[PDB]
Design a binder for this molecule. Structure first.
Ligand SMILES: [Mg+2]
Ligand SMILES: [Mg+2]
Ligand SMILES: [Mg+2]
Ligand SMILES: [Mg+2]
Ligand SMILES: [Mg+2]
Ligand SMILES: [Mg+2]
Ligand SMILES: [Mg+2]
Ligand SMILES: [Mg+2]
Ligand SMILES: [Mg+2]
Ligand SMILES: [Mg+2]
Ligand SMILES: [Mg+2]
Ligand SMILES: [Mg+2]
Ligand SMILES: [Mg+2]
Ligand SMILES: [Mg+2]
Ligand SMILES: [Mg+2]
Ligand SMILES: [Mg+2]
Ligand SMILES: [Mg+2]
Ligand SMILES: [Mg+2]
Ligand SMILES: [Mg+2]
Ligand SMILES: [Mg+2]
Ligand SMILES: [Mg+2]
Ligand SMILES: [Mg+2]
Ligand SMILES: [Mg+2]
Ligand SMILES: [Mg+2]
Ligand SMILES: [Mg+2]
Ligand SMILES: [Mg+2]
Ligand SMILES: [Mg+2]
Ligand SMILES: [Mg+2]
Ligand SMILES: [Mg+2]
Ligand SMILES: [Mg+2]
Ligand SMILES: [Mg+2]
Ligand SMILES: [Mg+2]
Ligand SMILES: [Mg+2]
Ligand SMILES: [Mg+2]
Ligand SMILES: [Mg+2]
Ligand SMILES: [Mg+2]
Lengths: 69, 262, 264, 231, 94
RNA sequence: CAACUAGACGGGAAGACCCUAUGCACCUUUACUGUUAUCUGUAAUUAAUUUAAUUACAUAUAAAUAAAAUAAAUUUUAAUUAUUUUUGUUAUUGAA
RNA sequence: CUAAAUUUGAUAAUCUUAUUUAGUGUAAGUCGAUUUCUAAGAUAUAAAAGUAUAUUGUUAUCAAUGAAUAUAAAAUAUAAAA
RNA sequence: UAGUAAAUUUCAAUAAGUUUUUGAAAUUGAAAAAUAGAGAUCUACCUCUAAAACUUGUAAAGUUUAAAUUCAAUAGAAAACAG
């Protein structure tokens, strides 16, 4: 997500648009970490927010993780 | 209300003498009690303006009826409490309407005694035939008497004799113009009016004069820090400073003469 | 309009000259050469100055001249209010010329009267003429502010002088306070002379009298309301374990009652 | 912009300059305004020209304004109640449910009123015998001398007449409290308030054992003459 | 690590995690970097911060005198998203 | 190479004490000149009458004794008694 | 924490709180804060004063190191408790 | 442009450390062109002038461009991406 968002906006954003039933919604915020370019000038990355959407239904693990490799 | 001569079990208890502060008879309340910031001799801008002053373990405030005009019922005394800055006792006072307050007590009182305020002459207190420690008008008083907390007719608060063991003896009485001539603790004289008001009898703790601290830590725990001579000090810091401990004239650090005729 | 003090109030309305927050924006500013007091008052263009004091050996040092000031309250016949005013001795010299104060504010040019406060009063004094239905409840900087108590004693107000119980806090406790003669009623003045005479002749005091019969009933009711609190006290001393400390105090408290008996 | 006016934080509304019409628009939004804001809206209508010719009992929003108060009256602070009373007093308003919930909102708060705020009750409830019972009025008389001595002069003589015409006046109140003030504190009242006195003392079967007509009043009038007009 | 030092004073407070747990007051209503500058502006910065917290959209319900919070769904923004079933258009034109 | 330290007027601070410079700093005082606190006469603010007091004007507090302003009640908030203050401020004289 | 590499880690290094590159990871109706209350204090600040621009700041906002609290919610008045 | 002009004590800026003038602080305060003021203290004679307002756009640091005067990487700027 964009970290400006909030849960009750996320809730109706999904149920209206993708139309999937949910029991619970969670939220976690992260800060973009600092790194170094090739020429060794610093630059900060972007801040982002994570959402752990809990559902009623079953899910296939193709969306839950990456393939077994 | 009595002195304690201590047995010299230490160096500081050899000469010490202090008063029984009567903790069993002090039922403490949260009705009249504030503890303010301790002012260590400083302004609001933090600068010291009066020296030799600091922390006080015995800081408090207890609100008192110096002026007891507002009620005339008879009263008793339930308890007591001690004040530090003047080393005076006080006592609660329960009026017949179950009211409550603190007062300045006089010497010779204690729990169980009665006290009131008086609008009218003395024969018309059928209760409280004894008269000590009562709020009374100066005209409505005997020939001989002594007053301890005076409230002049042109005034709200009291400004004289508020300390321990003090009083104001009478020299004259002029009922014509209603003008009395009272003596102060120093000896000076002042015109007062018989429409004014005061208490009867000396204030509590006549016996502070017969006291010995005996320990520096009894003053440190009041807000009295350590003084320093002007002679140990360097010449920058004090106008006596130097190696000579003799000095014409004898001065103050801001610059002015302390000892006159001298 | 060449006066900088006129440009500021220039575009104000009959409705914006009342907003006190906005006027204070204009009176609490700083002008180029004029002081910050000289706009709070009506000096007639006068300001202090500096210069060089001298000596015998011709040394020199900064010295400050200053301007006379005459703090004063004046009444404006138009506005029907009093106004504080600081002013020089040239204003007094002139107010008598133009006649009254409401003509000084209202005939001078702002170039000579270099105050802002003198032009704020001017415009409040023209609108009142152009509309006598103009309500001016409060004039700005008209009078100072007086508090009740100092800043130190703001704390001690918190706790009550006498605590009254719930049944009694709001009743008429008025006959109970101690009564000086000028405060007290007609009947009580007459009763006082009766009380004033029998003090000298207590043989005449009996319960067969209205006043004494009136009082003795009252006072004995007060005593009877205290005996419960008395009994609660004497129990405390009774169940108190140490008696030497008690007998010690009674030796002291007697020393006070003896003095009071034999005063001299 | 330089030199801004340094205005406070509070978002309240100053009606004190607004025209009367500009007040009524903001009274449309009565459900949302704060109770301290209504007080400043209604009292000022009294100060605007043309409030006598109107009957505000029939005006739409002023009517609904009351019906919002009568619900939320006991929620309000004790100061506020004295601010409404005067406003509905000054606006000539009659609403039975209004004058019930005020009175029960005042028996609560009678102990937190300033003297000046005890007066505006003592007039409003005695200037009309219909706004309450007599039991409530008898309480007010039993509470008057608490606040009497400290009130304005113009605020006493209005409280001194409303006793006599209603008949609650006793010897206790007259000889202890009232007569002492006029007999000692005599011209402090002023000229417009002594006129009313001299029409009442004769009605009272009064004696003049005092010598205050000459010595207290008449001897002390010419110390005030600035107050005197042709009327 | 190298070259991170002076770059990190300059950011200052780029996140809510940094200071002690009792430092950030009314966090989400205003972005930190606009709040941390105003607090260096002294007095009017405080007043300006208070006026924005008052008039902030992202307060989805009033506070309480207690630790509990009041949630009003009417302050929540609304979305006009319709149903897309039986919708023939598609995001690319032939 | 291990080891020692007699000497390289041995290495480390353009070193310690002493003298000069028409150099500096801080401190002292009956060193020179001076500033200020502070004391003082006249004048302004300040008016009338009487023979220096009295009154008048004015400021404030108190006596159960008006307030006002700061969002929320519209008309000099001027009575009396006692006491306080101009032992002031500004220009000026001389001293300090 | 995981994977890969060896460049000033007081040696070496397949190792990593030397260094380099990338990726993963902190789930809250309650806890801990925010919020309410207030202390010391801060303050180009309301009103108002002082004054040379030589300054103040009884309001208001901010400010624990303190006090109380989870399930219906807000408020006036009173009393008691923590 | 009447509490103005001007005057007495002091200071300031006027080349002048002193004797003006122009202005300010304090104190006083005028006339009516027949009047008033300056002319290095005062007097006389004469001469000159009339003590109201307004009016000269581009000043300044910063960026960029064109040109002249200059340096060519221990120079030029602190910096040939560096506040
Ligand atoms: Mg979370
Ligand atoms: Mg100091
Ligand atoms: Mg000392
Ligand atoms: Mg010593
Ligand atoms: Mg020494
Ligand atoms: Mg020194
Ligand atoms: Mg010295
Ligand atoms: Mg020796
Ligand atoms: Mg201001
Ligand atoms: Mg002054
Ligand atoms: Mg931490
Ligand atoms: Mg919690
Ligand atoms: Mg060796
Ligand atoms: Mg050597
Ligand atoms: Mg030489
Ligand atoms: Mg108002
Ligand atoms: Mg003098
Ligand atoms: Mg002088
Ligand atoms: Mg591994
Ligand atoms: Mg290595
Ligand atoms: Mg390997
Ligand atoms: Mg390592
Ligand atoms: Mg590790
Ligand atoms: Mg906090
Ligand atoms: Mg804490
Ligand atoms: Mg010169
Ligand atoms: Mg020169
Ligand atoms: Mg001159
Ligand atoms: Mg001139
Ligand atoms: Mg000239
Ligand atoms: Mg000349
Ligand atoms: Mg010549
Ligand atoms: Mg010009
Ligand atoms: Mg090269
Ligand atoms: Mg090179
Ligand atoms: Mg270079």
């Amino acid at each position: 997500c964009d970290p400006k968002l909030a849960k009750p906006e996320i809730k109706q954003y999904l149920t209206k648009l993708y139309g999937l039933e949910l029991n619970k919604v969670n939220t976690v915020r992260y800060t973009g970490k600092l790194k170094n370019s090739i020429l060794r000038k610093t630059f900060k990355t972007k801040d982002f927010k994570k959402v752990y959407a809990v559902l009623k239904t079953e899910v296939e693990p193709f969306y839950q993780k990456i393939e077994t490799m | 209300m009595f002195l304690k001569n201590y047995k010299p079990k230490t160096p500081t208890l050899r000469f010490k003498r202090d008063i029984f502060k009567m903790t069993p008879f002090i039922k403490k309340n949260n009705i009249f009690f504030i503890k303010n910031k301790n002012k260590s001799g400083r302004s609001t801008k933090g600068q010291i303006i009066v020296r030799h002053r600091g922390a006080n373990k015995y800081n408090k405030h207890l609100s008192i009826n110096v002026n007891r005009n507002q009620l005339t019922n008879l009263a008793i005394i339930t308890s007591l409490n001690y004040i530090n800055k003047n080393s005076c006792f006080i006592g609660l006072i329960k009026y017949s309407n179950n009211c409550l307050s603190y007062i300045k007590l006089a010497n010779g009182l204690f729990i169980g005694n009665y006290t009131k305020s008086l609008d009218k002459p003395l024969n018309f207190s059928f209760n409280f035939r004894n008269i000590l420690g009562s709020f009374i008008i100066l005209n409505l008083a005997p020939k001989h008497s002594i007053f301890s907390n005076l409230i002049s007719f042109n005034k709200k608060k009291s400004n004289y004799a508020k300390s321990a063991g003090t009083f104001l003896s009478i020299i004259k009485k002029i009922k014509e113009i209603n003008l009395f001539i009272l003596k102060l603790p120093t000896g000076e004289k002042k015109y007062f009016s018989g429409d004014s008001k005061a208490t009867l009898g000396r204030n509590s703790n006549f016996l502070n004069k017969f006291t010995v601290t005996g320990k520096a830590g009894i003053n440190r725990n009041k807000g009295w820090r350590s003084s320093v001579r002007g002679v140990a000090m360097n010449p920058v810091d004090h106008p006596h400073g130097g190696r000579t401990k003799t000095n014409q004239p004898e001065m103050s650090p801001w610059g002015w003469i302390t000892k006159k005729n001298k | 309009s060449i006066a900088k003090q006129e440009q500021l109030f220039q575009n104000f309305n009959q409705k914006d000259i009342l907003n006190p927050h906005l006027v204070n924006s204009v009176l609490e500013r700083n002008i180029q050469k004029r002081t910050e007091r000289s706009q709070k008052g009506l000096f007639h263009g006068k300001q202090p100055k500096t210069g060089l004091q001298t000596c015998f050996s011709e040394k020199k040092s900064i010295r400050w001249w200053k301007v006379n000031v005459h703090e004063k309250y004046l009444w404006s016949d138009i506005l029907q209010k009093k106004i504080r005013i600081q002013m020089s001795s040239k204003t007094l010299r002139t107010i008598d010329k133009y006649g009254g104060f409401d003509n000084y504010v209202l005939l001078t040019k702002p170039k000579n009267m270099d105050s802002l406060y003198g032009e704020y009063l001017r415009k409040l004094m023209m609108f009142k003429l152009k509309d006598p239905s103009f309500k001016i409840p409060y004039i700005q900087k008209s009078t100072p502010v007086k508090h009740e108590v100092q800043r130190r004693r703001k704390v001690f107000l918190k706790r009550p002088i006498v605590w009254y119980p719930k049944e009694i806090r709001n009743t008429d406790l008025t006959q109970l306070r101690m009564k000086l003669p000028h405060n007290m009623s007609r009947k009580e003045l007459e009763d006082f002379k009766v009380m004033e005479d029998l003090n000298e002749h207590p043989e005449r005091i009996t319960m067969d009298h209205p006043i004494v019969k009136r009082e003795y009933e009252k006072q004995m009711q007060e005593l009877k309301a205290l005996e419960p609190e008395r009994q609660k006290i004497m129990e405390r001393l009774e169940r108190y374990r140490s008696k030497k400390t008690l007998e010690k105090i009674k030796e002291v408290c007697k020393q006070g009652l003896d003095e009071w008996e034999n005063v001299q | 912009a330089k030199h801004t006016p340094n205005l406070p934080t509070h978002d309240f509304l100053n009606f004190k300059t607004m025209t009367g019409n500009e007040i009524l628009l903001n009274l449309e939004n009565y459900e949302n305004l704060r109770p301290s804001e209504i007080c400043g809206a209604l009292i000022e209508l009294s100060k605007r020209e043309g409030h006598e010719e109107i009957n505000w009992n029939e005006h739409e929003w002023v009517a609904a304004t009351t019906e919002h108060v009568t619900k939320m009256m006991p929620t309000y602070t004790p100061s506020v109640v004295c601010y409404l009373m005067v406003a509905f007093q000054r606006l000539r308003i009659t609403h039975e449910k209004l004058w019930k919930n005020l009175t029960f909102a005042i028996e609560k708060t009678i102990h937190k009123f300033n003297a000046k705020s005890f007066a505006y009750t003592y007039i409003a409830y005695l200037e009309d015998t219909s706004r309450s019972s007599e039991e409530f009025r008898k309480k007010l008389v039993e509470l008057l001398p608490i606040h009497l001595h400290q009130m304005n002069p113009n605020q006493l003589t209005r409280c001194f007449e409303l006793t006599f015409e209603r008949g609650y006046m006793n010897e206790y109140l007259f000889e202890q409290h009232f007569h002492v003030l006029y007999w000692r504190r005599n011209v402090w009242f002023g000229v417009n308030n002594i006129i009313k006195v001299l029409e009442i003392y004769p009605k009272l079967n009064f004696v003049d054992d005092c010598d205050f007509f000459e010595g207290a009043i008449l001897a002390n009038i010419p110390k005030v003459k600035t107050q005197l007009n042709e009327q | 690590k190298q070259g991170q030092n002076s770059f990190r004073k300059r950011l200052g407070v780029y996140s809510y995690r940094m200071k002690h747990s009792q430092y950030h007051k009314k966090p989400g209503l205003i972005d930190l970097r606009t709040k941390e500058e105003l607090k260096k502006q002294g007095v009017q910065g405080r007043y300006k911060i208070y006026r924005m917290e008052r008039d902030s959209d992202r307060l989805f319900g009033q506070f309480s005198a207690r630790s509990k919070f009041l949630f009003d769904s009417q302050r929540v923004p609304f979305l006009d998203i319709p149903d897309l079933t039986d919708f023939d258009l598609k995001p690319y034109v032939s």
